[PDB]
Amino acid sequence: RPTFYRQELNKTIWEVPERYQNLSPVGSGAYGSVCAAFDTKTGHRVAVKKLSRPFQSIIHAKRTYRELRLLKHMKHENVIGLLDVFTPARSLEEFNDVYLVTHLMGADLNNIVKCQKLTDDHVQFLIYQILRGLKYIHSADIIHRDLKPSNLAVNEDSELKILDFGLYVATRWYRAPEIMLNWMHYNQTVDIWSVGCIMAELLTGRTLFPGTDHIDQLKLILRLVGTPGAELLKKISSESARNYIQSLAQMPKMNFANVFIGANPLAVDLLEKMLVLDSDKRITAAQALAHAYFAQYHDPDDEPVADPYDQSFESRDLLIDEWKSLTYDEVISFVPPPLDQEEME
């Protein structure tokens, strides 16, 4: 049995195995807060997330189970997965705290594009990695729904992982219009809209749709992509919203080549395929990986899909103690991955 120690971090007690040393706060995460640490077993740097009040209500309890199940399933180089999960509890009766461990990623994408005019080759690499991770999560019927630069973890060598998928005023600047405006049906390509917004900003250094509210954001979007047809109204429940959109003066789609002046023409073409209002016409992650913009990185042998993921629990209402016990089971059954899981191609 491992020995634990206590340390006050972010004004609360963390209780962690002696294996993890030199804890230092590196910000909040979904439903928790994060510390960087040194893993003395392997000499690797890790990030430890302490979940906040994981079993306070059925909402917290089910989201704790959801996140642990999700992260235990994710095994992809561009997606946050788990090195460890631990609790100081010695039994289910004592179980009230959950800590998740992953490889340390020092930055988010805002740290990459803020003070650096990125080269096109570098933008290609960043977007390629997002799309590789999305192909994997989408293949398990998992969608992000709120993909944005602050949900992309990046290390010192620009290697990137998607986080907080499948789950305070948040930015809406990167959200798919069908999500932001609560349209009646959508698909995995909500995340592709977000990729387009991120890519546009990496190329120009400026936010693509910096709307002040949902109406202002929609107007900015429609100025670029043009007014939609009546078919798109099919997806919108609110009559007031439909009447408003229909009432707007007709706007043509802009030529993206005139918007992204001086960009690689292949980048412009890809943006045209991502930034489309009709979600059934939007390019998928797998299709985008085959686009010529990524020719120097694309490798079909290294763009894997996910093992099937059983999400039957999502439709079930269980008691708090049932979610807690299921979560405890998943903590106990966790098998740490090998330190080296890759081989030369």
Ligand X SMILES: Nc1nccc(-c2c(-c3ccc(F)cc3)ncn2C2CCNCC2)n1
Binding residues for ligand X, per CB under 6 A? 26-27, 29, 34, 36, 47, 49, 80, 82, 100-102, 104-105, 108, 153, 163
Judged by CB, which is closer to ligand X: 137, or 181?
137
**By the rule CB under 6 A, 257 interacts with ligand OG2:** no
Judged by CB, which is closer to Ca ion: 45, or 223?
45
Q: What's the chain's Rg over C-alpha atoms? A: 22
**By the rule CB under 6 A, 266 interacts with ligand OG2:** no
**By the rule CB under 5 A, 301 interacts with Ca ion:** yes
Task: Determine whether 164 is an active site residue.
Answer: yes
Strands 20-29 and 32-39, by their bridges, are antiparallel
Judged by CB, which is closer to ligand OG2: 33, or 194?
194
**Binding site residue list for ATP:** 26-34, 49
Choose, by CB under 6 A, the member of 210, 308, 336, 337 that binds ligand OG2: 210
Listed residue (215, 142, 220) closest to 181, CA to CA: 215
Judged by CB, which is closer to ligand X: 110, or 255?
110
Judged by CB, which is closer to Cl ion: 213, or 307?
307
Listed residue (215, 165, 216, 175) closest to 195, CA to CA: 175
213-242: contacts with ligand OG2 (CB under 6 A): 220, 223-224
Smallest separation, CB 27 to ligand X (Å): 3
Smallest separation, CB 176 to ligand X (Å): 22
The helix/strand/coil state of 199 is helix
Choose, by CB under 6 A, the member of 233, 257, 259, 286 that binds ligand OG2: 259
Question: What is d(CA 41, CA 18) in angstroms, rounded to the nearest whole number?
Answer: 10
Choose, by CB under 5 A, the member of 213, 231, 317, 342 that binds Ca ion: 342
Judged by CB, which is closer to ligand OG2: 11, or 206?
206
Choose, by CB under 6 A, the member of 206, 213, 247, 345 that binds ligand OG2: 206
How many of the chain's residues bind ligand OG2 (CB under 6 A)?
Answer: 9
From first CA to last CA, the distance across the chain in angstroms is 39
Pick the catalytic residue: 39, 97, 164, 191? 164
Residue type, 87: T
The site partner of 259 among Ca ion, Cl ion, ligand OG2, none (C-beta below 5 to 8 Å per kind) is ligand OG2
- x/- letters, 260..299, toward Ca ion (CB under 5 A): ---------------------------------------x
Can you list the pairs that 177-185 forms with residues at least 24 positions away whose Cβ atoms lie under 8 Å? 177/218, 177/221, 177/277, 178/235, 178/279, 179/145, 179/146, 180/214, 180/217, 180/218, 181/214, 181/218, 181/236, 181/241, 182/237, 183/235, 183/236, 183/237, 184/235, 184/236, 184/237, 185/235
DSSP per-residue codes, 235-289: T---HHHHHHHHHSPP-PPP-HHHHSTTS-HHHHHHHHHHS-S-TTTSPPHHHHH
Q: State the residue number with the nearest CB to ligand X.
A: 29
**Binding site residue list:** 26-34, 49
Question: What is d(CA 334, CA 238) in angstroms, rounded to the nearest whole number?
Answer: 45
Question: What is d(CA 122, CA 230) in angstroms, rounded to the nearest whole number?
Answer: 39
196-235: contacts with Ca ion (CB under 5 A): none
270-329: contacts with Cl ion (CB under 5 A): 310
**Which positions are catalytic?**
164
